[PDB]
Structures are given as C-alpha cells and as structure tokens.
Paper text:
In the nucleotide pool, which is more susceptible to oxidation by reactive oxygen species than DNA, human MutT homolog 1 (hMTH1, human [name]) is the most prominent mammalian enzyme among other enzymes responsible for sanitization of the nucleotide pool. hMTH1 is characterized by broad substrate specificity as compared with Escherichia coli MutT; that is, hMTH1 hydrolyzes different oxidized nucleotides such as 8-oxo-dGTP, 2-oxo-[name], and 8-oxo-[name] with almost the same efficiency, whereas MutT shows high substrate specificity for 8-oxoguanine nucleotides. Accordingly, hMTH1 prevents mutations and cell dysfunction by its hydrolytic activity toward both 2-oxo-[name] and 8-oxo-dGTP. Here, we carried out structural and kinetic analyses of hMTH1 and demonstrated that hMTH1 shows broad substrate specificity for 8-oxo-dGTP and 2-oxo-[name] because of the exchange of the protonation state at Asp-119 and Asp-120 depending on the substrate.
The structures of the 8-oxo-dGTP complex and the 2-oxo-[name] complex (high resolution) enable us to apply the bond length analysis for determination of the protonation state. Asp-119 and Asp-120 buried in the hMTH1 structure have low B-factors (average 14.1 Å2 in the 8-oxo-dGTP complex and average 6.4 Å2 in the 2-oxo-[name] complex (high resolution)). In this case, a residual peak around Oδ2 of Asp-120 is observed in the resulting Fo − Fc electron density map contoured at 3.0σ, indicating its protonated state. Although the difference in the C—Oδ bond lengths of Asp-120 was 0.04 Å (1.23 (1) and 1.27 (1) Å for the C—Oδ1 and C—Oδ2 bond, respectively), Oδ2 seems to be protonated due to the smaller associated standard deviations as well as the peak in the Fo − Fc electron density map. In contrast, during the recognition of 2-oxoA, the protonation states of Asp-119 and Asp-120 are switched in comparison with the recognition of 8-oxoG. The hydrogen atoms at N1 and N6 of 2-oxoA participate in hydrogen bonds with deprotonated Asp-119. We emphasize that the exchange of the protonation state between Asp-119 and Asp-120 is required for the broad substrate specificity of hMTH1.
Author numbering: 1 to 156
Write the structure that this text describes.
C-alpha cells in the first residue's frame, strides 16, 4: 500500500460566481485552482483549510463546510495526495494577489475548465449542485488522467 499526505482545497463559491487563484509562474503557470495547501501538525483539517485560505488568498470566513475528498496519484510519485475539499459559508475581506497567485472571480457560466486541473471538470459540477463526493484520479504529468473514480456520497 501507499502513504498519503494531507492537503486542503477551498472553493469560494457564491450564488453566481466562484473565486479561483491562478498560479503565476513555474511548473503549471496559468492554471486556475481553489485555495489550499498541506495540513500541518496539530491542526484539524478544517482549521488547516481556513489557515491556508487566509495565507493563500487573504480571505477569512469563520466557517467552512466539507464537500468532498479526492485522492490524487501521480505516475512516478509513491506518495498519494489526500485532498479534503471545502466550500465557504460566507467570506470576509477582499482577495489579494501575491507573488505566487492572482485571484479572480468567474461567473458560474464561465468556469474556466480548460485552464483548471482536468479532474475539476468531473467534480465541480457536483460541487455546483451542492452535492458531496469522493474521488480518485491518477495522472501522467499535469494533463492526462489514466484512471479515476468519482462517486456522490451522503457523508464525506
Ligand atoms: N489535481 C488537482 N486538482 C485540484 O483541483 N486541485 C489540486 C490538484 N492537485 C493539487 N491541487 C491543489 C491541492 C492543494 O490545494 C494544492 C497543493 O498544495 P501545495 O503542495 O502547493 O501546498 P503547500 O503550499 O502547503 O506546500 P509547500 O510547497 O510545501 O509550501 O493544489
Ligand atoms: Na502550506
Ligand atoms: Na498552495
């Protein structure tokens, strides 16, 4: 079996729009993503998701709700990424551009799927329907899915 590392992903989803972050330079520049990163020792996953949202975007919320869990496997990497996915309840602050990331709102009829991780095309729609999910995606590099599962669940 494999070991897994914990990550978070937060979708700042409002009734008509979603806030995404564009990676500004390096490996995978121009890709839009939710906000998140690695869970740290001692914090709950939800608290880590809030912390990462703040560090990454400048936003605070005071509450998230869990919407899904997705495991990513990359060819050549033995460690799995176990990504815990949340959506915001309500938000405080304006988002801020950093050296790493530029935030932008997108209307929900303009979700930039071609410039997002390919898996997002599969699980976003569930997210938008306010449903919960478990997923797994195996990637060759950044663009090619070799195997995946996706299942709606009642409890994440
Ligand atoms: N296939 C994928 N689909 C997706 O929608 N988000 C993905 C993804 N693969 C990775 N992500 C997200 C998960 C998480 O929010 C982020 C990856 O976290 P990072 O490794 O950048 O974390 P950290 O910034 O904590 O790491 P350090 O570089 O160690 O500081 O990208
Ligand atoms: Na981090
Ligand atoms: Na990050």
């Amino acid at each position: 079996m494999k070991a897994s590392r914990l990550y978070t992903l937060v979708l700042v989803l409002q009734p008509q729009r979603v806030l995404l972050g564009m990676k500004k330079r390096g490996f995978g520049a121009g890709r839009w993503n939710g906000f998140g990163g690695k869970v740290q020792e001692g914090e709950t996953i939800e608290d880590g998701a809030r912390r990462e949202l703040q560090e990454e975007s400048g936003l605070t919320v005071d509450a998230l709700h869990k919407v899904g869990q997705i495991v990513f496997e990359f060819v050549g990497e033995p460690e799995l990424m176990d990504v815990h996915v949340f959506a915001t309840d309500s938000i405080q602050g304006t988002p801020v551009e950093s050296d790493e990331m530029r935030p932008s709102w997108f209307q929900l009829d303009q979700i930039p799927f071609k410039d997002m991780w390919p898996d997002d095309s599969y699980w976003f729609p569930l997210l938008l329907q306010k449903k919960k999910f478990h997923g797994y995606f195996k990637f060759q590099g950044q663009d090619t899915i070799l195997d995946y599962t996706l299942r709606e669940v009642d409890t994440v």
